[PDB]
Design a protein around this nucleic acid. Structure first.
Lengths: 247, 317, 211, 317, 317
DNA sequence: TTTTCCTCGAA
RNA sequence: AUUGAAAGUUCUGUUUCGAAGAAAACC
């Protein structure tokens, strides 16, 4: 798992927020950035990297249209038969999982006689100013290139096992687009569920670092690493990406 | 018993949904009765139900139970908590139906040895000899704090578009912000103990051996709820959760702390605990408090800093 | 011969059960009316010596003409029969000559219950005057005897059995006398009937028939 | 004499059951006619009988009489108000039966000395020489107000279940809510007075001594009725009661106020009281009114606040 | 006797249900008559039945009675309050049926010596010689406060889903919010005292010895009701209760306070108590008031802070 | 705005 | 003081146990 908190400085949609002051609480209307305007950039960067490194890319997703496999017309264009029953569903997923990388890392849904679902392996949220915009991101790399539907083994899983390493490497590499004036950045790599503190407070890196060890001790974990960037301490996001790839 | 009250702050949120209208996804809303200076009023405010929390708790319990070697049922190994309500689950898991009332006890014990979830979370089977087992963890809705005259909550709708190169694509999602509060209760004294009344049946010694492990796992499971891992639409609507105030009480007698509505609900529950220990002839009463907002607390009460510390402390005792 | 009209506002109703399964009467018999009148004079006593038997404190008043009629709509119910007519109105006519106007008016303004204990009844107003004896064709509303000949259409006639004064003594049954009422059975109401009474008393625009 | 008209408001009520059908308890109801422009309607509306009120009044009188030292009969010490009606009751109490009519008064006095309830409540003895005595308090049915174009009275049925662990247990109860009205009469002047013509018999001096206390007790027994301590099923279906309007008149001649049906029944009874007092040559006639529903009253009336003040003023005069 | 009135504020609750229609679970509702400036109206509002409160009170009484060493019946040891109505309960407990009327007293004493529940809560046996014992605690429905012109209550339905991986699962639950009020009464002077009349029977001295302990336990049992431990569906629909106003009166004479409908039901009942002590020749009258909402109370009345204080003060006297 | 379900049991 | 006079259809009982509207999308 890779869980991170990012603070930004940048110098129209509005949303309501509940804000805390000494007198109590208030309701305010503040400009925001939607949670799907960030997923598109990440998925586009993933497409570019996967094509550059020889990984399979879907026919429709080769163009920057992420309809994926929602409609039967998309099924006809891509050229994959629709699922027949619940038992066949797993097979279908493998096929969908063996042609398009985006349908694996980012998840997908097909609705019809035998709907098939696969939740995203990357989870994002809205961007709210602390303007000092801040947000957080979460990824579970332990499930990339792993079938999620429950069923018997199907032919072709050997190719998935072979390509798992490159798929995970590409998914890790793809975060460079989202991470790219950065002010404060915290990244945590664990083997147990964990959520870093948001960037609402000036002193949050210390709090999450302190909580990391206690969480590892209480959850019977075996790996927990943290990385901090302020403008272990690094200088550029490229070094952080290289370290994440190496470790 | 371990009881507690928790106060949360969540922004730009949609964790619970309801049936959609047109191209609009609706956030759950409910009516609440509030007291102002002018009298009593009725309002409609967004809420979050109490069955998402139970689902998250049971999922974390399944994960921990499989991690530490405790048995886990077949269907509940998948995150599908039908438990043992229908006959299809019984056929899949491989447990015979109860014959009479006298056999009922046996059935429960058998079930009680195959899945921890059917033990901690309780279950129900309906038929010739219905068998019931109330959940050992009790949860409630997530309501915004009814403090003052103005509710600190808001709800709106947002507009989203799918992009395509051959138009022939538009939807709306409801988003809320609130100061959520909720209380919980878990009686660890009855975990891994049969609730049906009858005669002793072979297989309860193994039940007694695992009691410490089951209690430890059940206590460890609460980290998920106290940390904020529940709900849906977390892929693109990840909430910005935060903890503000928390009170946990460990007692040997029935007790319930004050709901986190009023700004002073820690002092009141501490005083009520001090008096209730005497009036009910108790022999144990401990309080743990987490305060991150700066409200009045009291005296003679342990003060912590995080949730892992509370989990460790509850495990130790 | 003098007369007095009295308007009564009943509280919840009235009920007088039949002699000898306890059905009730649609309208109170004259004996109940005479007793309600006598209450004003003999209050506080429940037994007197008539000379040979302890009959009742109302045996003395046994030569006063009294009739009554409805003025609203009520319902008869068997749930001991009862007549539910809350806030209703009743009109009772007292015709007599054995006492002066003062005695009749004082006794008439002192009526509190008709029937049994629970049947409270207020008095709204009374009017005292003189009556004229007639024998021609008349139109009447109050219930009369069976022997009164009727010329109209026999469409609103009910037949009941009442008792004479001989029923004022305990351990004895009043003599049976059949009466005819111009009443609609359901809902309860009263309608006018034209008759050719041999002897009737005009009492202010309503020819009360007696025989 | 003292007469009264009272208007009550009651919610979620069942003080008078009737013959149950199957597993359902039904309320007592009566038919009324409501006139409309189209025509007429026959509605069925809940009522409360008048015998239950008599039982409550007699029980309260028993309690007060035994507390202040007045004699109370053997059977009537228990709440079995059979009174000295049959030979068995007389044998239990120990009173000889009357021989002929002439001794009747004598017998009454003896009874009137042994029991207080037999005096205020009245009795009747059936036998060779019957002796009768009318009650000194009269109470009418409790029927809601037929005021205006609507009947504010509703009646429903509710579902209850008994829970068990060996199923082999379901009942239904009707609950009513209405705006009740009733009127009552009490002639304190005839209390402790024999009700038969004849020569004075020994023992009436004791009655003359006890008359003041007996009248005081009879007046005090009205507080229970006017406070709402009557009916049945009070353990689980305890009703909610409130007082809206009350007019009680103390006179020297027979008189009764207007029924509490019309929204204006206070003015009419004042006018009728004036006319009756003028025509009957009365010397004292006073009116006490408790007003809570804001109806018109008039002039020439004492205005009270509660029922205790009413009872005190009744005792004083 | 100890009487009282209590006001609660409850949100997002479903404590009592009724027969379901389709996939919808219905909350209990009842009609009420409310007086507005325009006249009188009939409305339908959610209510909580008065028998669940009795069940909660009796369960707490069982717990305390077993804790402190008082005897508890066999079937009542499990939380099944059939008591002694049927012959099967008598066969299980081991008590012979009464033979005639004269033996009746004996039977009660035996039943009165094995179960505190059959003593405090009253019971009924129907047969050749029926035996009745009225409950010593009296309760009623929980109704929203009928204050002003608008009822401060609301009821709605919510949509819930069960999750599966092989669709082949949807239900609806009614949820209410209200400002509930209810009143209670308990006569401790008759606890551990036989009610059937007869002759003295061996075994009453032991009853006299335990009278103080039985009264202590009965007064202690009220803590559950006054704290809010009752109702159903508490596992996932745990309500958010809160206490606003409470008045309790201890007297030696029958008395009932004002229902908690109007904003001024404390001053009125205190004045009524002050006058009623004088009118009925009483010798004891005490009042305790808890006021959290800030309404007029009065003068010369003790002001408390919690419920445990009230329990201790009730025990002391 | 598209797919799926849309209460079981024992009184 | 009226077919009137005297009368509690009253006591005893949880509608309870359990179940994510979740997955995909650029203003």
């Amino acid at each position: 798992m890779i869980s991170g908190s990012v603070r930004f400085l940048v110098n129209h949609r509005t949303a309501p927020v509940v804000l805390k002051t000494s007198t109590g609480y208030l309701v305010r209307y503040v400009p925001v950035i939607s949670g799907e305007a960030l997923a598109h950039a990440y998925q586009a960067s993933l497409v570019d990297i996967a094509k550059k490194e020889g990984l399979p890319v879907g026919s429709l997703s080769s163009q920057y249209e992420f309809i994926k496999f929602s409609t039967d017309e998309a099924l006809k264009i891509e050229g994959i038969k629709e699922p027949k029953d619940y038992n066949d569903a797993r097979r279908f997923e493998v096929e969908v999982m063996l042609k398009d990388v985006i349908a694996d890392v980012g998840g997908f849904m097909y609705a019809g006689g035998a709907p098939v679902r696969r939740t995203s392996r990357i989870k994002l949220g809205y961007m709210i100013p602390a303007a000092l915009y801040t947000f957080s991101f979460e990824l579970d790399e332990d499930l990339i290139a792993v079938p999620s539907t429950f069923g018997e083994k199907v032919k072709g899983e050997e190719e998935l096992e072979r390509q798992k390493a490159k798929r995970v490497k590409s998914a890790i590499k793809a975060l460079y687009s989202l991470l790219s004036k950065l002010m404060s950045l915290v990244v945590t790599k664990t083997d147990f569920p964990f959520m870093p503190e948001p960037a609402h407070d000036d002193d949050y890196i210390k709090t999450t670092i302190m909580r990391l060890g206690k969480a590892k001790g209480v959850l019977n974990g075996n790996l927990a690493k943290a990385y901090v960037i302020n403008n272990t301490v690094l200088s550029t996001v490229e070094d952080l990406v290289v370290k994440l790839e190496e470790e | 018993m371990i009881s507690g009250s928790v106060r949360f702050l969540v922004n730009l949120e949609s964790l619970n949904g309801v049936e959609s209208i047109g191209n609009l996804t609706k956030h759950r809303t409910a009516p609440v009765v509030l007291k102002t200076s002018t009298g009593y009023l009725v309002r409609y405010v967004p809420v979050i139900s109490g069955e998402a929390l139970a689902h998250a708790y049971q999922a974390s319990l399944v994960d921990i139970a499989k991690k530490e070697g405790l048995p886990v049922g077949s269907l509940s190994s998948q995150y599908e908590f039908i438990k043992f309500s229908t006959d299809e689950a019984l056929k899949i898991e491989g447990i015979k139906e109860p014959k009479d009332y006298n056999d009922a006890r046996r059935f429960e014990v058998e079930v009680m040895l195959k899945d921890v979830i059917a033990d901690v979370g309780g279950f129900m089977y309906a038929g010739g000899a219905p068998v019931r087992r109330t959940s050992r963890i009790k949860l409630g809705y997530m309501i915004p704090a009814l403090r003052g005259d103005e509710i600190p909550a808001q709800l709106e709708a947002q507009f989203h578009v799918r992009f395509s190169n051959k138009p022939v694509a538009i939807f709306n999602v409801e988003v809320s912000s609130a100061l959520y509060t909720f209380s919980f209760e878990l009686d660890e004294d009855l975990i891994a103990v049969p609730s049906t009344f009858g005669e002793k049946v072979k297989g309860e010694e193994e039940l007694e051996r695992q009691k410490a492990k089951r209690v430890k796992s059940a206590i460890k499971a609460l980290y998920s709820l106290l940390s904020g891992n529940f709900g849906g639409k977390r892929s693109r609507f990840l909430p910005s959760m935060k903890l503000m105030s928390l009170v946990v009480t460990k007692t040997d007698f029935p007790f319930m702390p004050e709901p986190a509505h009023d700004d002073d609900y820690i002092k009141t529950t501490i005083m009520r605990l001090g008096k209730a220990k005497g009036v009910l002839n108790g022999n144990l009463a401990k309080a743990y408090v987490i305060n991150n907002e700066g409200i009045e607390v009291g005296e003679g009460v342990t003060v912590l800093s995080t949730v892992e510390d509370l989990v460790v402390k509850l495990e130790e005792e | 011969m003098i007369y007095s009209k009295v308007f009564l506002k009943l509280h919840w109703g009235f009920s007088v059960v039949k002699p000898l399964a306890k059905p009730g009467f649609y309208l109170p018999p004259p004996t109940t009316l005479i007793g309600a009148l006598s209450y004003g004079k003999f209050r506080g006593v429940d037994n007197i010596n008539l000379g040979n038997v302890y009959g009742s404190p109302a045996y003395n008043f046994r030569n006063i003409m009294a009739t009554a009629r409805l003025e609203s709509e009520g319902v008869y119910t068997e749930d001991t029969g009862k007549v539910y007519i809350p806030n209703g109105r009743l009109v009772v006519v007292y015709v007599t000559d054995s006492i002066s106007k003062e005695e009749l008016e004082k006794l008439c303004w002192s009526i509190t219950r008709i029937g049994c204990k629970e049947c409270l009844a207020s008095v709204e107003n009374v009017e005292v005057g003189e009556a004229k004896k007639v024998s021609g064709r008349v139109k009447t509303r109050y219930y009369f005897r069976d022997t009164v000949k009727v010329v109209g259409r026999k469409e609103f006639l009910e037949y009941v059995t009442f008792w004479e004064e001989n029923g004022y003594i305990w351990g004895k049954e009043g003599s049976p006398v059949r009466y005819i009422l111009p009443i609609t059975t359901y809902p309860l109401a009263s309608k006018e009937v034209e008759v050719e009474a041999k002897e009737a008393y005009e009492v202010g625009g309503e020819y009360v028939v007696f025989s």
